[PDB]
C-alpha cells in the first residue's frame, strides 16, 4: 500500500471503503478497494483479474499483504446514480439510455458466458466516462464471499432460492433500465417483505401458472396477498413499445423464462442503437 497515495474517499462499498488513489510509481490514478483472508477468496479473485471486457471495470491488481486484501481497479469519473440525480430535471436522453443498456447487456453477456455473476447490480456500481462508455464494477465479488439496497434484488433471491442464476443480473438491470426512463426507482423497498410486496403489486402476485414451482420456494407463504398485474404502459410511460416489450422480458418472474443478456442484445429495441456522448460535469 505504501505504493499508493489516497486522494479522496469515493464511497463505502459492500466489503470495504473505496478510495481514489495514485500509484506512487506509475503516477496512475486508480480506485482502491480495501476488503474487510481465506485462500478460496484469493483464487476466486485471481480469476477475476483475467476477466477483461470493455464494459467491465478492469481489476488491475490484487494486493494481499499483512493478512489484508486490497483490490486495485481502473478509475472512472462518475457512477450512474450521481449522473441520474444530475439529469433529474430533464431526464437522460433516450438514445443515451439505450446505449447504456446495450453496453451493460454486452458486459453481462460476457461475464455470464464465463459463468460469473454480479448478484448486486445497482446505479452505484455502474460507472461512466466522458466518451459515452458505461461499465460494471464489483463483478464476481459476491461469489468470492449503511443499509444495502434491496431495490434491484430478483424475486427468486427474496423467496429464498439458494442457487440462483445469471438471471438475477438481468432482473436488476431491468429495474435500472426502468429507473433511467421514469426517473424514479421501480421497486424502492425498505425491507425484504416490502420489496417483495412492491414487486407483487406491480407485476402481480406470482403463482404456478406464470412461475412453476414458486409456491414451493423456501420463503413462499400461501398467505401472501394476491394482487393483480398492472400494464407496463402505466409502469414506464415514456418508453416505447419496443422498450416496454424488452423490459417485460427482463422482468419475467420465472428465472428460466427471463431473457438472457445475449438474446436481449438481439431485441428490436436495439435496432437503432447509437453511442451518444453524455454531458458530464466533473
Ligand atoms: C461518489 N459518487 S461519484 O459519482 O462521484 C464517483 C466518482 C468516481 C468513481 N470512480 C470509480 N472507479 C472505479 C470503481 C469505483 C467504485 C465505486 N463504487 C464502488 C463500490 N467501486 C468499486 C471499486 C470497484 N469508482 C465512482 C463514483
Could you characterize the architecture of this molecule?
This is Cyclin-dependent kinase 2. The modification Phosphotyrosine is found at residues 15, 19. Its cofactor is Mg(2+). It catalyses: L-seryl-[protein] + ATP = O-phospho-L-seryl-[protein] + ADP + H(+); L-threonyl-[protein] + ATP = O-phospho-L-threonyl-[protein] + ADP + H(+). It is a single chain. This protein has helices at 39-48, 80-86, 94-113, 141-144, 155-158, 167-182, 192-203, 232-235, 241-250, 261-265; strands at residues 4-12, 17-23, 29-35, 59-65, 68-74, 78-79, 126-128, 134-136. With 282 residues, it is of the alpha+beta class. The protein has two domains: 1-77, Phosphorylase Kinase, domain 1 (2-Layer Sandwich), CATH 3.30.200; 78-280, Transferase(Phosphotransferase) domain 1 (Transferase(Phosphotransferase), domain 1, Orthogonal Bundle). Strands 1-2-3-5-4 form a five-stranded antiparallel β-sheet, with helices on one face. A three-stranded antiparallel β-sheet has the order 6-7-8. A hairpin with a 5-residue loop joins β7 and β8. Bound molecules: the ligand CNS(=O)(=O)c1ccc(Nc2nccc(-c3cnc(C)n3C3CC3)n2)cc1. The site of the ligand CNS(=O)(=O)c1ccc(Nc2nccc(-c3cnc(C)n3C3CC3)n2)cc1 has 19 residues, from β1, β3 and β6.
Amino acid at each position: 500500500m505504501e505504493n499508493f497515495q489516497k486522494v479522496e474517499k469515493i464511497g463505502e462499498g459492500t466489503y470495504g471503503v473505496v478510495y481514489k488513489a495514485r500509484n506512487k510509481l506509475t503516477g496512475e490514478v486508480v480506485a482502491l478497494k480495501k476488503i474487510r483472508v481465506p485462500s478460496t477468496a484469493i483464487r476466486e479473485i485471481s480469476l477475476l483479474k483475467e476477466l477483461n471486457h470493455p464494459n467491465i471495470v478492469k481489476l488491475l491488481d490484487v494486493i494481499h499483504t499483512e493478512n489484508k486484501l486490497y483490490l486495485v481497479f481502473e478509475f472512472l469519473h462518475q457512477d450512474l446514480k450521481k449522473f441520474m440525480d444530475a439529469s433529474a430535471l430533464t431526464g437522460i436522453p433516450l438514445p443515451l439510455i439505450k446505449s447504456y443498456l446495450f453496453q451493460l447487456l454486452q458486459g453481462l453477456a460476457f461475464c455470464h458466458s464465463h459463468r460469473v455473476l454480479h448478484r448486486d447490480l445497482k446505479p452505484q456500481n455502474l460507472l461512466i466516462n466522458t466518451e459515452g462508455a458505461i461499465k460494471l464494477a464489483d463483478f464476481g465479488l459476491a461469489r468470492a464471499f449503511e443499509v444495502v439496497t434491496l431495490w434491484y434484488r430478483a424475486p427468486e433471491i427474496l423467496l429464498g432460492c439458494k442457487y440462483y442464476s445469471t438471471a438475477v443480473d438481468i432482473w436488476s438491470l431491468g429495474c435500472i433500465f426502468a429507473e433511467m426512463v421514469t426517473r424514479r426507482a421501480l421497486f424502492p423497498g425498505d425491507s425484504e417483505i416490502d420489496q417483495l410486496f412492491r414487486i407483487f403489486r406491480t407485476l402481480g402476485t406470482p403463482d404456478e401458472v406464470v412461475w412453476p414451482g414458486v409456491t414451493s420456494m423456501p420463503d413462499y407463504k400461501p398467505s401472501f396477498p394476491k394482487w393483480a398485474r398492472q400494464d407496463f404502459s402505466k409502469v414506464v410511460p415514456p418508453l416505447d413499445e419496443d422498450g416496454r416489450s424488452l423490459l417485460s422480458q427482463m422482468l419475467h418472474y420465472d428465472p428460466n423464462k427471463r431473457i438472457s443478456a445475449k438474446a436481449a442484445l438481439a431485441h428490436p429495441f436495439f435496432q437503432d442503437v447509437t453511442k451518444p456522448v453524455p454531458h458530464l460535469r466533473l
